[PDB]
Amino acid sequence: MTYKLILNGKTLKGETTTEAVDAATAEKVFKQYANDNGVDGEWTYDDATKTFTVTE
Q1: What is the CB-side half-sphere exposure of residue 1 using CA atoms within 13 A?
Q2: C-alpha 39: how far from its chain's center?
Q3: Where are the annotated sequence repeats, by residue?
Q4: 8, 53 in Cβ contact below 8 A?
Q5: Domain-by-domain residue ranges, the chain?
Q6: How far apart, in whole angstroms, are the C-alpha atoms of residue 54 and residue 41?
Q7: Which ranges of the chain does DSSP label H, i.e. alpha helix?
Q8: What would the CATH number be for the domain defined by 1-56?
Q9: Burial (Cβ within 10 Å: 0-12, 13-18, ≥19) of residue 3
Q10: What is residue 11's DSSP assignment?
């Protein structure tokens, strides 16, 4: 499945997507993505749209 990540950080804002077997795996990939880009916020995941959002 293809997942999307909406990043609302203080410095970085945008949208990307990832391909993953399930949401638990996309969540790991995205968190690492966020982490590597200096983002540290609150997360939500909406299965109805397959979207993750991180917000600082």
Answers
A1: 14
A2: 10
A3: 2-56
A4: yes
A5: 1-56
A6: 6
A7: 23-36
A8: 3.10.20.10
A9: buried
A10: S
3-state secondary structure at position 17: strand
- Reduced to 3 states, what is the DSSP secondary structure of residue 44? strand
What is the gyration radius of the CA atoms in the chain, in angstroms?
10
Report the sign of the C-alpha dihedral through residues 12, 13, 16, 21, in that order. Answer: positive
Output the CA angle 22-47-14, nearest 5 degrees: 90
What is the maximum span of the chain, computed from C-alpha positions, in angstroms?
30
Whole-number Cα distances in Å, 18 to 10, 51: 22, 10
Q: What six digits make up the tokens of 16? A: 């990307």
Is the C-alpha dihedral spanning 26, 17, 14, 46 positive or negative?
Answer: negative
